[PDB]
């Protein structure tokens, strides 16, 4: 039969990058904020004119990498140094990464995309994509 | 600004197997040696099998009218007529490095929303469409 | 050799987002599904919005127009129509692999400097470059 | 004079990503199946859609791993980390992935392929590859 | 499902390096300055010989050149004359990257198999389909 | 089969470096905003200068045009000419990722072997040529 | 409103590889120096022609690492060695490279471009790309 | 004035290669090898068909980082073991590798070129890298 499952809109994404960026302003840090549908291909892209250009590929690794392992990429990173997790997953797909501040976006049980910071290093990175994710709570 | 939680037919890995499979059965019957290709929507494979005696740019050819059919929302044999008869810019074929405007391409449909492409290359032209067709039998 | 210290426009990142967000609502209220893509003054984006039914081509496709009226300062109509007038040599096609000469890529001036692009792909020719200069409307 | 051997064939490939797919349904996993032919080129991929598309590059790179070095992608992995191969083998090809799930096809004795399944983690991806290719048994 | 277990005969690295070997030296007594590609059936690099004299555009020349005609099972040339006579869709030129429909690529068939591809770059033309059958002599 | 050592003039780094310098310069004072590179002999870059409004276009259409001169050993504009004429197949375009055929790049020559090539773009046409001779002027 | 900030001139980013390949050659070095603007685009490059090609791939990733993270190739290295940076910074980016001679590029407190340096090795790779840096005191 | 050096040529690579593979034959391996010329670009490759494809990668990237550091892949992988060589030089190109089978090509004292094996590991690449080099003793 026919699955019906939801899919993140671009209206939810748009959302999601503008509400991180208002955050990032009032906190002082300049990064890039990417949003990733559930293929991994990018819905939204916000970049500060600070930011280095490689938060643009910061943040959609971590995105990719959240949306498609379906955890947050702190947590893989912290897998790899307790030795639950094998280290060659950082190899897996050239779309990887294993730095703090992607986060897997979820609707109605069902992985649906992912949300990377980039710019603001680990701590700040998380936060502020949690920030993006929480504006879909449901 | 996010509005409401939208829901939408997703192609299923063993809708994406069953349409891959009954292609290759009747690429045999007909004498071609092909690869299909599913992708989902956004352009991603899910099923791919290919004969081992059709060439290796048919991964490429199959994967690449996939991706242009469920991305164009179109077949890319429509493409291919528009381009030869002027309404569409020849530089269409420039805008993707994933494009092929050849036959073979077409968008997989459920419940009005595409939700993937299927292609199929190595049949030359017209049998490349046909096996495509065959494949969204099989949802039917 | 070095000589003086020369300072110039920014586009920043609010702006940058200001006009994604104004396409995007003109897109919408006009019944298109687009991707707009702003980039800076040496190609790197800024700023992207998609339409989740707009195809993943369209990344690219917006992507590589605003690249392109960045880096040539100049309308990707306007290469187009010289392309088509043999005032361009067609091989400017194959320059640069982020090159598409079709058109809804506009080049960003601020004090008369470029100082980014802005391109819009999914609308089809003319409703590009449309939605593409309503972008540029809002750093007026 | 010329040399005869066995090649791999779309049916055998088609063969083993169906067992595959179907075992791991019976297991309650969501991943992709990938087989290459000898030089390492996709015969046959199948994947399920909970699966995150970084499971078409981990199933590809680890069959072409397999496929190429004539050994298990585990057997490489465990090699590193007791000290007799090189960590270096890491880098050698950006189709090499160590994680376990890769098993090399073998047909009278000739490697004609290569098997890897992404998505279910190391141990399970094992388990699904063997299936596989137990399938060409003979 | 799997079927039986079906035996080919496999071009050998021996095969594979005497071709080249035969191609550059008549290259040498000839006058011309090329690259030699062999590929396996699958297009990928079983020999390559270049002659310093020859601009490294030749490595690519004739490895797009050995794939294409490994994939296609057809001379390069054959398909370029195709494309200019109307029964081949120049579009074809898109369908993979490694593609290159410039005469001098040739199947290598071994008992009815094609077992791989040979390309020659350098010698402009009909000198590398030429050149390119030199090499299938060492076979027989 | 190695044969003696063989012994040819090296572009040096002073060379490459000299030569991109005077470029800039003539560009400068002609009213050009580009980008000039040159390769060694196997296509891989020495020297490159840019000018900050020179789009970064620029960089790889001077890169293709140098290394397509170095490689060709003859002037793009001269393949461009040939293409026109119908004495180059058009689909020499395809033969290498790192062509361009327009104008702007121009073999590098001491003591009649080819070490290297430059390459200029952003001053349109004959322009290109223009600068990319004067460069040459430094090695004499 | 409309800001203001200082652009990397063609100028200056050529005066500083003429500085770096004459100090060079004083030291008897081969090498490659590149300089990148803002957002991570060549400027400039000059490669001794004894310097090896790999050069010109790590003068480059140090120009755009230093230009994008703001701070020293060599900082970021000395950071993972001491635990303060996570060691998966390395992945961030196809063009990074964590090899001492990248020095970001600042004028009146702007970052504007980076410089980089390779074929050295990393005490006179980050010797030279000073020397570069200094040609645009202020 | 005009430097003139030496130029590796096709025929001396042609011969290297030729020598590599008759000694591979004697000694049971299935490799490539591949030399590449001063700028790290292809003059001679030769492939078993038994060799796995990730070989041709393999004798590349080790071809071309010997010819671009002008040392053995061996000494640098030693090198990083010892702690003389910052790990990081493993980044710093995409056509690097340290896996041992890389020796630079020298003439008269210019390094003009790079030997490289892959598919018997590393004491076996390197010892037939080294038949190959020293065809052109002089």
Redesign the interface.
């Known amino acids: 039969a ?15 990058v ?1 509400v991180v ?1 208002h955050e990032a302003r009032e906190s002082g840090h300049a990064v890039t904020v990417t949003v990733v ?22 943040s959609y ?1 971590k995105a ?2 959240a ?4 955890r947050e990429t702190v947590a893989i ?1 912290r897998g790899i140094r307790d030795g639950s997790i ?1 280290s ?13 501040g992607g986060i897997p976006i979820i ?2 049980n069902v ?1 649906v995309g992912g949300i990377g910071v ?1 710019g603001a290093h ?1 701590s700040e990175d998380g936060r502020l994509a949690r920030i993006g994710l929480l ?2 709570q ?1």
């Not at 559930?38 to 938060?55: C, E, F, K, N, P």
């Not at 060659?88 to 703090?100: C, G, K, Q, T, V």
């Open positions: 026919i699955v019906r499952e939801p899919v993140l809109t671009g209206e939810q994404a748009q959302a999601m503008e960026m549908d559930r293929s991994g291909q990018i819905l939204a892209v916000l970049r500060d004119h600070h930011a280095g250009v490689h938060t643009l590929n910061a690794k990719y990498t949306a498609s392992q379906k990173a094998p060659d997953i950082r190899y897996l797909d050239p779309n990887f990464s294993l730095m703090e609707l109605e992985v980039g680990g504006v879909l449901h």
